[PDB]
Amino acid sequence: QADYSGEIAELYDLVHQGKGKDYHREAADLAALVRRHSPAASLLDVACGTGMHLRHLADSFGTVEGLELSADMLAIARRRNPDAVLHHGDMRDFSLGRRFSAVTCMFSSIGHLAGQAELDAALERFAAHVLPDGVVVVEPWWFPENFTPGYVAAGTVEAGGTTVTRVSHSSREGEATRIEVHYLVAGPDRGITHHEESHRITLFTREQYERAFTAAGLSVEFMPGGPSGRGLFTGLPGA
Amino acid sequence: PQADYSGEIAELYDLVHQGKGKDYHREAADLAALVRRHSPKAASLLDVACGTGMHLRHLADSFGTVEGLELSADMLAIARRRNPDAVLHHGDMRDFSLGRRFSAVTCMFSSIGHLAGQAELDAALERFAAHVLPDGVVVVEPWWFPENFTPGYVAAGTVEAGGTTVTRVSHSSREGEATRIEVHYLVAGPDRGITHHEESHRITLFTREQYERAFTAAGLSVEFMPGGPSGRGLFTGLPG
Ligand SMILES: CN[C@H]1[C@@H](O)[C@@H](C)O[C@H](OP(=O)(O)OP(=O)(O)OC[C@H]2O[C@@H](n3cc(C)c(=O)[nH]c3=O)C[C@@H]2O)[C@@H]1O
Numbered sequence A: 001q002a003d004y005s006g007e008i009a010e011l012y013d014l015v016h017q018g019k020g021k022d023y024h025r026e027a028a029d030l031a032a033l034v035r036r037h038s039p040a041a042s043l044l045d046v047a048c049g050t051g052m053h054l055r056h057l058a059d060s061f062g063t064v065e066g067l068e069l070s071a072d073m074l075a076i077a078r079r080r081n082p083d084a085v086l087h088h089g090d091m092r093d094f095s096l097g098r099r100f101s102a103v104t105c106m107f108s109s110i111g112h113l114a115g116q117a118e119l120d121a122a123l124e125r126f127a128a129h130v131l132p133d134g135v136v137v138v139e140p141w142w143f144p145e146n147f148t149p150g151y152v153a154a155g156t157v158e159a160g161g162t163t164v165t166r167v168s169h170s171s172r173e174g175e176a177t178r179i180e181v182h183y184l185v186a187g188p189d190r191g192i193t194h195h196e197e198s199h200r201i202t203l204f205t206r207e208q209y210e211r212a213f214t215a216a217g218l219s220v221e222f223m224p225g226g227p228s229g230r231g232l233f234t235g236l237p238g239a
Numbered sequence B: 001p002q003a004d005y006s007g008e009i010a011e012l013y014d015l016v017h018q019g020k021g022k023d024y025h026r027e028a029a030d031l032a033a034l035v036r037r038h039s040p041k042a043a044s045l046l047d048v049a050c051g052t053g054m055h056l057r058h059l060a061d062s063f064g065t066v067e068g069l070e071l072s073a074d075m076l077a078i079a080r081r082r083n084p085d086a087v088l089h090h091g092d093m094r095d096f097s098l099g100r101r102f103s104a105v106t107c108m109f110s111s112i113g114h115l116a117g118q119a120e121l122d123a124a125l126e127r128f129a130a131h132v133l134p135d136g137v138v139v140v141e142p143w144w145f146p147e148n149f150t151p152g153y154v155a156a157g158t159v160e161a162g163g164t165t166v167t168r169v170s171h172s173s174r175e176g177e178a179t180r181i182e183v184h185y186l187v188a189g190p191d192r193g194i195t196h197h198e199e200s201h202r203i204t205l206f207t208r209e210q211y212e213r214a215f216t217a218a219g220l221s222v223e224f225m226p227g228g229p230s231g232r233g234l235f236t237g238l239p240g
C-alpha cells in the first residue's frame, strides 16, 4: 500500500513509540515555537495522522483542529481526541473558512507532495489559514544533499503481549526516496501476519521549500536539527 | 511455507543462531566433558542431524574422530564446507546404517522433536544404540515436554553482520501432540532491498516417559538431566 490504512494505520502508534518518537517533547517544543511568534489561541495540525501531536497540544491552546487525508488514520485521531474537530481533506485543496494562530505540518508529511506545483499549493493553503500575527511550521523531508541511499532501518517493539517488527529500505528514485517497508506482527492469540507498504517521498530542496513559502507570501526561516534531524521551516505572513 | 531446512533458511541459520546467542563452543565443551565422564577413553563421535555442522567443528578439537548424519542436502552442504576433513553422511535418523560404532552418538537442539511418533522415536533410538560402543553414551536433547509448552509463545530477534540484516519472528501453538511453530524472516540490505521468508514445522511434544521408553526399548539405561543447552534438559543413555 501507499495510503496509511488498515493494519498499517493501527500499527503506526506503536511502531513509533518503539522508535522513541516523543510527541510530548515535540508538542511542547512546537507549542513554544509558536508562542515565540504568536504570544495563543488556536492551532491547525495538517496531516495530523493518528492525532498524537494534537493530544499534547490541546492543553496548550484555546483551540486545536486537524486535517488528515486517510480515513483509517483519522478514526484513530478522533478516538484519541473525541472533543476536537478533525477534518477529512487534502492539504493541497481545502478551505475551512477560519484562521488559526499556528498551522503545523509535521514528520515530513509534506514529502507526500509530488512537485513544486503541489508544494506551492499547500503553502498557499497554509498561508490562507493563518492569522496575520500567526505562524506556519513545516518539518520537511531530507534534502537531496542529505539523502543516504541504501539505508536499512530495523526495529522491534512489544506492548500488550503484541510484538511488531518493522524494516525499511530506502533507495533513490528521480527526486524522491522510494522507501519500502515490511512488518511482521505477532501476538499470543492472533498469530503472525506479514505486511508491506511502499512510498514515494519527494526530495525537495531547501530552496524549493523556501520558494513555496515566499510565493505564499510568507517570510521563511530554516532551523536545523528539528524533531527528526531534518530541521524545521517556519513562515510568517506579510512578506 | 517450507518444512525442509532448505535454500534461504539454511544460508541464514548460522547467522540467525549467533544472533540468538547460541554458543556452539561451550555446548561442545560441555558435551565432551559429559561424554568423557562416562567414557573416559572416548575418542570417536557421531552427531545425528548435525545441521550446518557447528557442534562438529568444535568437537573435532576434543575427539580424534567425528562424523555426522543429516537429512537436508542444503544443510549438509554447509556442514561439509565447515568440515572438509570429516565424513558426513546423507540420510535419516530413522533408518540408516553406517559401517561402524562410536564412543558417543549425539542429537542436539531438539532435532529429535522432528519425529512424528513413538514408532519413529523408538526407530531412531534403536539406530543410535546400534552405533554406540558398550563403554559409551548416547545423548539426546529433547524438545519441550507437554507439561512445559507455552501455546502462544512469540520470539523476535534481529541481527546484522557484514551488510546483511536479518529479523526473525516465531509464533507457536498446540497442534495435537505437536508444537506448531511458524517462523518469518525479513532479510535486507543496501543493494538487495528487502525479502520475506517463512517456514512452519510440527515439533512433536513427547512426554518424558516416551523418550525414556524409547531408550529403554533400545537397551539403553536412560537418565534425564535438567537444564541443558536450552532449558530442555538432556537425556543420556548407556548400553547394558
Ligand atoms: C510520515 N513520515 C515517515 C513515513 O513516511 C515513513 C514511511 O518513512 C519515514 O519514516 P521514518 O522517519 O520512520 O524512516 P526510517 O527511520 O524507517 O528510515 C529513515 C529514513 O531517513 C533517511 N535518512 C536518514 C538519515 C539519518 C540521514 O542522514 N539521511 C537520510 O536520508 C533514510 C530513510 O529513508 C518518514 O519519515
Ligand SMILES: CN[C@H]1[C@@H](O)[C@@H](C)O[C@H](OP(=O)(O)OP(=O)(O)OC[C@H]2O[C@@H](n3cc(C)c(=O)[nH]c3=O)C[C@@H]2O)[C@@H]1O
Binding pocket: B020, B109, B110, B111, B144, B148, B149, B150, B151, B153, B155, B170, B171, B172, B179, B181, B183, B201, B203
Ligand atoms: C532445531 N530446533 C529448532 C527449530 O526446529 C525451530 C524451527 O524452532 C525452534 O527454534 P528456537 O528453539 O530458536 O525457538 P524460538 O526462539 O523460536 O521459540 C522457542 C520455542 O519454545 C517454546 N517454549 C519456550 C519456552 C521458553 C518455554 O518455557 N516453553 C515453550 O514451549 C515456544 C517456542 O516454540 C527449535 O528449537
Ligand SMILES: Nc1ncnc2c1ncn2[C@@H]1O[C@H](CSCC[C@H](N)C(=O)O)[C@@H](O)[C@H]1O
Binding pocket: A003, A004, A046, A047, A048, A049, A050, A052, A053, A067, A068, A069, A070, A073, A089, A090, A091, A092, A105, A106, A107, A109, A112, A113
Ligand atoms: N495530501 C495530503 N493531505 C493531507 N494528509 C496527507 C496527504 N498526504 C499524506 N497525508 C497524510 O500524512 C500522514 C503521514 S504520517 C504523519 C503523522 C503525524 N503528522 C505525526 O507526526 O505522527 C498520513 O496520515 C497521510 O495520510
Ligand SMILES: Nc1ncnc2c1ncn2[C@@H]1O[C@H](CSCC[C@H](N)C(=O)O)[C@@H](O)[C@H]1O
Binding pocket: B004, B005, B048, B049, B050, B051, B052, B053, B054, B055, B069, B070, B071, B072, B075, B091, B092, B093, B094, B107, B108, B109, B110, B111, B114
Ligand atoms: N529424520 C531426520 N534425520 C536426520 N536429520 C534430520 C531428520 N529430520 C530433521 N533432521 C535435521 O534436524 C536438524 C534440526 S536443526 C538443528 C541443527 C543442528 N543439530 C544444531 O544443533 O544446530 C535439521 O538439519 C534437519 O534437516
